[PDB]
């Protein structure tokens, strides 16, 4: 049942699709922001969300949402990833720039397994929708509802799989079991980012920019 | 002969004298800004440096300079720390903040050792300028000028020491040697500062809004 629909979530993914390796993600911050903000309002039941909680959820989901995406995009290529910046990173470069570690976990833990199951855009979008509706998010004005939008998505997602793919009766669960992978890679990335800042140039303590 | 008069550095020190435990350091940013910069201008020849260098040195020294100040300030206090903003801090209180690790060192490697040598404002000021005139800072248009200025500050400070205490023939080296202690205490704060933003998460990836 589509008290929370699916082919629309596909449409959603389709809307936002695009028709030195570190910097490129720190280039495009504006675009990712573009991509990410629109996609959320195109999620059924998403905008009806209090404006404040709309926020928490984008803030909280930012990394994963954004990682899930390029992972699924690089199904298309052996040996690398393809960023929304219309550029494409390589194992040798990333390594050479000291993020080989994060690079490898993405291909081994996210791309290859997404390939191996030949995941599609309804699936992708549906996982994302899950990530977006996160009840454990800090300071949700109404959280005990947000669980429902999630409850409501995965359900619908059981079906799409159940019909399109009844030979595999646990493909669904196989799908959910990539979420832990996605967290952990989400925090690993965050760790690197904090590290690089830290061994960063004297322009390391510029936090003073909070300033209030 | 002198042309980095100790009297001037004294005048500068004096000019800036002040006239949740953790969270209270952070919002003080604006007054610290004023206190660092009004102090710096009053060091001879600092203003002669290309303006673009001036920014770096301060940016660079921000930490150590602040830390050097409050440490001295608290040679009054007992097993505590006094901040430019007037709030005292105690070990039980700090450790109930995880900054116990800084606190210990501040006290046992700076606050107490200054208490010990009855370190004075001229001396402190001089070490402070030495910290400021830090030619290892990145992007200096001309590392060498800073080198020279640094060298004068410590030349006069040597001469000062000898004069005022001809008996203590080590006070000058004693002083210089408070410096690695001070440099590492600074990084240790950044390590906390960083681990806090990180682990706290809550509002953790607010790195966006770096040109975002």
């Amino acid at each position: 049942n589509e008290d929370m629909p699916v082919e629309r979530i596909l449409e959603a993914e389709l809307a936002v699709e695009p028709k030195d390796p570190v910097t490129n993600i720190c280039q495009a911050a504006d675009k990712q922001l573009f991509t990410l903000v629109e996609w959320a309002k195109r999620i059924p039941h998403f905008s009806e969300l209090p404006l404040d909680d709309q926020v928490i959820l984008l803030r909280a989901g930012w990394n994963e949402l954004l990682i899930a995406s390029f992972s699924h995009r690089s199904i298309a290529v052996k040996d690398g990833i393809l960023l929304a910046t219309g550029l494409h990173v390589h194992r040798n470069s990333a390594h050479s720039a000291g993020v080989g570690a994060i690079f490898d976990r993405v291909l081994t833990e996210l791309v290859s397994k997404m390939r191996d199951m030949q995941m599609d855009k309804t699936e992708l979008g549906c996982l994302r929708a899950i990530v977006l509706f996160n009840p454990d998010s800090k300071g949700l004005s109404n959280p005990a509802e947000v669980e429902a939008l999630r409850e409501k998505v995965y359900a619908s997602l059981e079906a799409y799989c159940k019909h399109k793919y009844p030979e595999q009766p646990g493909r669904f669960a196989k799908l959910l079991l990539r979420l832990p992978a996605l967290r952990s890679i989400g925090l690993k990335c965050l760790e690197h980012l904090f590290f690089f800042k830290l061994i960063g140039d004297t322009p390391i303590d510029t936090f003073l920019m909070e300033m209030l | 002969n002198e042309d980095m008069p100790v009297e001037r550095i004294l005048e500068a020190e004096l000019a800036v004298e002040p006239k949740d435990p953790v969270t209270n350091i952070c919002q003080a940013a604006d007054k610290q800004l004023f206190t660092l910069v009004e102090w710096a201008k009053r060091i001879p020849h600092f203003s002669e440096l290309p303006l673009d260098d001036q920014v770096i040195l301060l940016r660079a020294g921000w930490n150590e300079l602040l830390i050097a100040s409050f440490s001295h300030r608290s040679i009054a206090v007992k097993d505590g720390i006094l901040l430019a903003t007037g709030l005292h801090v105690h070990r039980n209180s700090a450790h109930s903040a995880g900054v116990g690790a800084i606190f210990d060192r501040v006290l046992t490697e700076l606050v107490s050792k200054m208490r010990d040598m009855q370190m004075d404002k001229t001396e402190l000021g001089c070490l402070r300028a030495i910290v400021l005139f830090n030619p290892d800072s990145k992007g200096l248009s001309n590392p060498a000028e800073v080198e020279a200025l640094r060298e004068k500050v410590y030349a006069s400070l040597e001469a000062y020491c000898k004069h005022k205490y001809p008996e203590q023939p080590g006070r000058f080296a004693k002083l210089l040697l408070r410096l690695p202690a001070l440099r590492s205490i600074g990084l240790k704060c950044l390590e906390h500062l960083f681990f806090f933003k990180l682990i706290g998460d809550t509002p953790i990836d607010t790195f966006l809004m770096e040109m975002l």
Binding site: L33, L51, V55, L58 | L208, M209, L212
Partner: peptide, 11 residues
């Protein structure tokens, strides 16, 4: 304040 930026896109 990052909120602001998002909100301004959220409309």
């Amino acid at each position: 304040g990052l909120e602001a930026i998002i909100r301004k896109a959220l409309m």
